[PDB]
Amino acid sequence: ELTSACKKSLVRIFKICDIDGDNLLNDYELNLFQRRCFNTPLQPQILDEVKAVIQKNVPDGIYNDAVTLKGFLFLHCLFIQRGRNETTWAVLRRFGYNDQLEMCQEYLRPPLKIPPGSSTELSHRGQQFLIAVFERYDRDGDGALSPEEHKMLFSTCPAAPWSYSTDIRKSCPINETTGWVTLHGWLCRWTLMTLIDVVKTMEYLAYLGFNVHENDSQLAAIHVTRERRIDLAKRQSSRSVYKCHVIGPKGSGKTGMCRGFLVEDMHKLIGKEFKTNVVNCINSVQVYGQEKHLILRDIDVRHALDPLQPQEVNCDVACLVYDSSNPRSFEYVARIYIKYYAESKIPVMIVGTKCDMDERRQDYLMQPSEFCDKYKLLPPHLFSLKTNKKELYTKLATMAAFPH
């Protein structure tokens, strides 16, 4: 008696209402989500009468005064019969379903106008929800999601917002022992998505039941920030997520640099080949007592004569990487800083990779140290994976967060 489409909708609602991930709807959530749908508290005897019907008609449907999925599916399968289908509908309606039993548009994609210069970040409520969701699907209680638990978490979605093995595991901080995405990396991946694709973030937040849990639009999960001159405002809006475009020639080792931002032990990537193209890597660094997220975009390598798009040039801080151990490498960095960043307002950092081998002279006119001196840049940051030093990542974020 239950539609195949109706069961698909009801099973998602059960998962969202399952605030413990214990496959049960205990007394608290039943009363909580009662107010979400009907604006009234669940009356004690009504719940008792509901439980009596379930335990009678269907086995393994009630486990310790808590409605199981089967008993929950049956209960609504009952409602549509006895003439009160508007009770089932009011529930489906609150979780963003229309009459054709599809997810509504204005429920998934509410209007959000972002002025140029402004960035989109996760608000406090948005983070709290994402942390809460993370723990319900972390069964081992070790602060990490397995690939199986990751799929379970997005089972209420049409599909995952990203790959587990080819995205979040290579672009975000994971656990060294297990290899699974940590709570930290979880918030990191969402932070990345929120910044560059706010619409997709909100769409996936509704699927996870942010609108119902918070009793508000998913606009309350998005915090619009902007760099602004002093206006003596009450509520400050300073940025916390900075994007860094890493631009360099081929074989300049700028890929292994980005991956090193995600692990403490960097001496496991000395001679590692990356058979996986990660566009954006992300982690956090402390900048003057505050947590700041830095996104390292591995800009596609190309010929020096090949052009560069504004969406590839414009960023918060530009990191130009060359090979100090290669004489025909620095020419690229010199060519690009002049063409795109010489008259730009973007802070630029020149980075010399592989200092643990042999400092070779650059066949270019000026040397890297001389180039920075001329255009008033900081001396070429010596970088290597053997040293395990992460001062560069802290320095990059500090350049983006500050003048000039």
Enumerate binding residues for ligand HSE (CB under 6 A): 17, 30, 33-34, 37, 91
Complete DSSP assignment for 89-106: HHHHHHTTB-TTSSB-HH
Q: Say if residue 223 is preceded by a cis peptide, omega within 30 of 0.
A: no
Nearest in space to 122 (alpha carbons), one of 230, 194, 208? 194
Minimal CB distance residue for ligand HSE = 33
Task: Residue 20: name its binding partner from ligand HSE, Na ion, none (Cβ under 5 to 8 Å by kind).
Answer: Na ion
Task: Residue 17: name its binding partner from ligand HSE, Na ion, none (Cβ under 5 to 8 Å by kind).
Answer: ligand HSE
Task: Residue 377: name its binding partner from ligand HSE, Na ion, none (Cβ under 5 to 8 Å by kind).
Answer: none
Flag whether 300 is marked binding: no
Complete DSSP assignment for 378-390: ---EEE-SSS---
Flag whether 311 is marked binding: no
Other beta carbons less than 10 A from residue 228's beta carbon = 13
List the structure tokens of 388: 């395990």
Residue 187: CB minimum distance to ligand HSE, A: 28
Flag whether 22 is marked binding: yes
Determine how β-strand 280-287 pairs with β-strand 290-298. Answer: antiparallel
Task: Residue 37: name its binding partner from Na ion, ligand HSE, none (Cβ under 5 to 8 Å by kind).
Answer: ligand HSE
Flag whether 250 is marked binding: yes
Complete DSSP assignment for 76-90: HHHHTTTT-HHHHHH
Identity of the residue, 109 or 136, whose beta carbon is nearer to ligand HSE in the bound complex: 136
| Range 44-72 burial, b when 16+ CB lie within 10 A, else e | eeebeebbeebeeebeebbeeebbbbbbb
Residue labelled with tokens 């009450």:
234
Other beta carbons less than 10 A from residue 223's beta carbon = 18
Nearest in space to 267 (alpha carbons), one of 356, 393, 392? 356
Task: Residue 210: name its binding partner from Na ion, ligand HSE, none (Cβ under 5 to 8 Å by kind).
Answer: none
Flag whether 353 is marked binding: yes
Task: Residue 34: name its binding partner from ligand HSE, Na ion, none (Cβ under 5 to 8 Å by kind).
Answer: ligand HSE
Identity of the residue, 90 or 304, whose beta carbon is nearer to ligand HSE in the bound complex: 90
Residue 41, judged by CB atoms within 10 A of its CB (0-12, 13-18, 19+), counts as exposed
Residue 63: CB minimum distance to Na ion, A: 10
Identity of the residue, 103 or 377, whose beta carbon is nearer to ligand HSE in the bound complex: 103
Identity of the residue, 17 or 145, whose beta carbon is nearer to ligand HSE in the bound complex: 17
How far is the C-alpha of 58 from the C-alpha of 170, rounded, in Å? 46
80 Cβ contact partners less than 8 Å away, ≥ 6 residues apart:
1, 2, 6, 88
Task: Residue 127: name its binding partner from Na ion, ligand HSE, none (Cβ under 5 to 8 Å by kind).
Answer: none
Residue 139: CB minimum distance to ligand HSE, A: 23
List the structure tokens of 118: 């402004």
Residue 75: CB minimum distance to ligand HSE, A: 6
Flag whether 29 is marked binding: yes
Which residues does residue 322 pair with via DSSP β-bridges, in sequence order? 352
Identity of the residue, 44 or 379, whose beta carbon is nearer to ligand HSE in the bound complex: 44
Residue 29: CB minimum distance to Na ion, A: 6
Flag whether 18 is marked binding: yes
Residue 214: CB minimum distance to ligand HSE, A: 16
Query: Which residue ranges are tagged as binding site?
Result: 18, 20, 22, 29, 138, 140, 142, 149, 248-255, 286-290, 353-356
Query: Which residue ranges are tagged as binding site for Ca(2+)?
Result: 18, 20, 22, 29, 138, 140, 142, 149
